[model samples]
Target chain A: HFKDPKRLYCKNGGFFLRIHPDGRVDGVREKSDPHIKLQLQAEERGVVSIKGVSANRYLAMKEDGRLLASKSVTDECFFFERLESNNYNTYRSRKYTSWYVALKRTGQYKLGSKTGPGQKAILFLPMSA
Target chain B: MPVAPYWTSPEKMEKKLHAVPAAKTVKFKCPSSGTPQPTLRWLKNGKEFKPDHRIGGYKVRYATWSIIMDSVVPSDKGNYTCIVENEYGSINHTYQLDVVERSPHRPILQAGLPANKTVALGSNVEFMCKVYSDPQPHIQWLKHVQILKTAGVNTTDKEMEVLHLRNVSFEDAGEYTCLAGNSIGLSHHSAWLTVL
Candidate 1:
């Protein structure tokens, strides 16, 4: 549930699920230097993983099943761009990008159950209104 | 039974008959038989009783046939007799009387605090004297030969005939005597009282 900055880094990003006392779940990732670039991918019930490609460049999955990428040249600025065919959102590189990031979603998603693999995808749905 | 005449010598008849354990009064009783009424007489030494002479002095009184003598002195001590007679016989019983001074018994004397043997003149002190005997011996308080009276002194007589003297004075200092007497005996005791 807790980590030190010296152990987490962009070259090898970390991810894990943390269950709180009140039955809430948290997914987390972090890197030591904000200028390092990292990638985090999570599926509804599949292999949730993360990787670091460069110092501050990363490819991540959004909750909407779209791929998002960013790269940073300075510690305070980065550029972000959505890479899926949907053209959802984009960003310009500034300071840091994908340095330490975490994402979480509640409710359930169907990813074929334990018998299948590689067919997992992140999904988001509307709650209440 | 044949009754003989009373035969007794003149010497025996002349002997004085007195009571024993003597005091002022002596008591005598006649025999039980009714036939003879005894005649009792008082004698000093061997002589007929007389009130004037020191050796023969006595006062006599009679109730029925019993004789009582009052204030018997030592000189009055002697033989006495009761003579009983009838036509058939005559008899007499003689008694020798000896006078002895009776000693007062159970003498008690008490005083108030600060001093048991000494008391302040004109201040209050207390003394008590008591005795027990037959005929209930008379009680008196004496400072030497003078008798203490209740006039100036606060006095009380308890149920046991104890005499109490309160508010002692200089005159109370002396030998105090409690004189007790009855028909059979006379007794007394003396105690010294001191006034500071």
Candidate 2:
């Protein structure tokens, strides 16, 4: 009848989503149900504008805002299937590239996060001509 | 084609001072501005004046438009002017001269309490000296008549000069003196330091 709830931290300050067992994804907060209804309505409008189709494996939308399709899945309670097929793939690739560049730039030199007596000793060597 | 040329009237003149010992030549620059080269005349008070009997007529450097006073004297102390003129207008600048005795004085040492008293071993000590004169005085420190050239001893700031000794030791014990002097005279103050 009921499943366990998962916790996730907000990375960039956004709303939280809860996956229900009935293949429905709902927002969870202690706010009034009217706020949740308004948010859902706004999400629907956004999906409409993007012509997205909601499905089990993916949620896709066309370039023009005209169509919407929702797919049901059993394995994942109510997660965003494939939110947007082409857009999702593109976003994933872009994010991978960004992380790769950041790691490469930072990995060029060793970063010292802590200091010790050895580090201090190496700082004050006598000068020679 | 062009309006008539109008020469601006010269404004009021001011004075400046430069000193040269007696029997020496001193130059005084005139303050004025005009178009064409103007005639310059030297005057004392309000009358035409010549240099002291010990000096001949002053020399003029027309390029810089300055007057030279040769072999000046106390009696030569008065107002002098450079007059310039053009077809449109004329102007003049006046300068005053005063002769007096000049003397030099050396520096004097003024130390604080602990500095004037004995310093304990392994402690810190500070000494200060100051001098008053026409030209500022320079302060230096000496240990038993020998100038202290150690690291923290040399300084050349304005009036007040200081000396600092860190981790004083028995060897640092001595008669420390603050010497202040300039061209005029020299004076100093000394304190006995006993380090235990």
Candidate 3:
């Protein structure tokens, strides 16, 4: 689940989430893009920074629950990784405690405020890349 | 489950002082545990300690925050602290290190001298004179009866004296001597260089 220093393809259903080099955050079905591989660097026991390999950025959730590829790490970049009962994992924003990182069925960024613990949009499978 | 960081052992925070001998390796270890495994940092004399070649343990093993020093000198003695903290709470311990300076002694030459070497003419040759002494030592290289000119002689703080001779010829082949002298005493080692 939460292994230190692992490059992962965080998958939500058929598509894998990617931190694009152009400061965009979305999902791609293809696994060939180097940006799809993200390094889960541990900040604490259960907290980590989702770092994009090619983009050289971090997956960050802002105060308004909007997501972006951050050029550098900030308080918003840290996520509390929790394993769900369904064998998937949920990444909740440490800065905005109520918000979670979610991707819609079509691999679009879902507004974190409307996401819930059991929602499919928020469930991610940390597949080893 | 939520838990605060706490020291697993050493129930007290009273600053302690330890006497250490110079030129010896020393280690400082602080053990702590918590629910979210606490992160540990080290400070030397109130400032964050740099993880240089001499000091280690910024990256911990087995969750123990331990700093190890290699061949500590008199200047290395200082007050050191280990701070352990987690999401819930934090704790720290401090200790002072006092280095006991020993009297100057004779130099110790590793392996007696540079190893003997044989090389063809027009080839470059090198030798390492490893010497360890207190108060530092001055090194000199001599060929036969004459002290060679200092050109490719290099000295490292890790008790190593390097002699590099370039473009060796028949005249350069002889018995080479490495002489080490310090405030206490002097020592010398020799090796033969045969050039074909």
Candidate 4:
């Protein structure tokens, strides 16, 4: 049960994200890519942050809702991943509080306003290995 | 005292664990051929966590006997074998039922990508982003503010990715970013690609 690495796929974009060491994040059309290191620590509230073990960074959103990686973390970096129908998830940014991580047809990462689900942009899936 | 039904299926079935992760369901079927026909039942770790909505597992019609496990969890991970008997003879079919636990973590960059890379104007350069995450993250590679092209790029959901550009050009050098996003959230890393 002690395994490292996990993959996240955008159900809307049908692609993947390729993250670098210094907080650069982007979307990919390839079938496979590296995994993220994270888990639910029951202790850490329902809020979760995508922490890069190798890169030593966390997934954080800007005021404009742009997604980026940062070495310094705050409550802003943590997000509550709420499950929706069809095995998809909606990530509510703890920092922005009103935006969710969404996918773009352009295959880029952005934060969508959380009036409601952004359908294609806000819905994400855990790709089966 | 009389012995009755016999087993036609092998008693041992080689079922590997982790084939399916937690929160997912799996099915086990037990059917047999014998005189007077035999009754079939399922067991987990020598105990019965019978088919129920409160837990997991379901029963099909009498003609077809099978157990359906719904929304499986770690507690459901164990040895599940079949037991059928009609007095004439008793038989057992071994099955290993494993419910894998899905990790809610993001991709962890382990190695391969360097902070800065310098290459000659006409030489070839490659950028590799090796990472790990529970389940797997959709990985994207980009340059500065634009998406990278599709050439010499190889990737796997649970492993490493390489972006190879042959005969590098001035435009090839700039700020590079790799974005890894999943159901949980997004994790990213950026580096500078400098071409001389």
Candidate number with greatest TM-score:
4
Q: Which one wins by DockQ: 2 or 4? A: 4
Where is model 3 more than 4 Å wrong at Cα?
A1-12, B1-196
Report the Cα lDDT for residue B151, model 3. 18
lDDT of 1 by residue, B117-177 (tens): 5668877655555454311233455666676632111221232233355787787777666
lDDT score, candidate 2:
0.38
Q: Which wins on lDDT, candidate 2 or candidate 4?
A: 4
lDDT of 2 by residue, A1-129 (tens): 001111211111112222233333333322222212211101110111011112222212222311122342121111111111111101111111111000111111111122122221101100011
- Decreasing DockQ order of the candidates: 4, 3, 2, 1
lDDT of 3 by residue, A1-129 (tens): 122223332334445778899879987655566678876654543456787878988899988888998897788897877654444567899999988988876767888878777676786655555
Best by lDDT: 3
DockQ scores of all models, one per candidate: 0.00, 0.01, 0.01, 0.03
Model 1, range A40-129, lDDT digits (tens) per residue? 221111111222333323333333322333242222222222221221112212223322222222212211121111111221110010
Q: What is the lDDT of every predicted structure here?
A: 0.35, 0.38, 0.68, 0.59
lDDT (10s digit) by residue, model 2, range B43-152? 77778765453347677776666788766777777777776666667666666664433233344444552255575689988766544332233445688868763211
**Positional deviation of residue B25's Cα in model 1 after best superposition, in angstroms:** 1.8
Which CAPRI level is candidate 4? incorrect
Residue range with the least summed lDDT across 10 consecutive positions in model 1 chain B: B151-160
Q: Say which docking band candidate 3 falls in.
A: incorrect
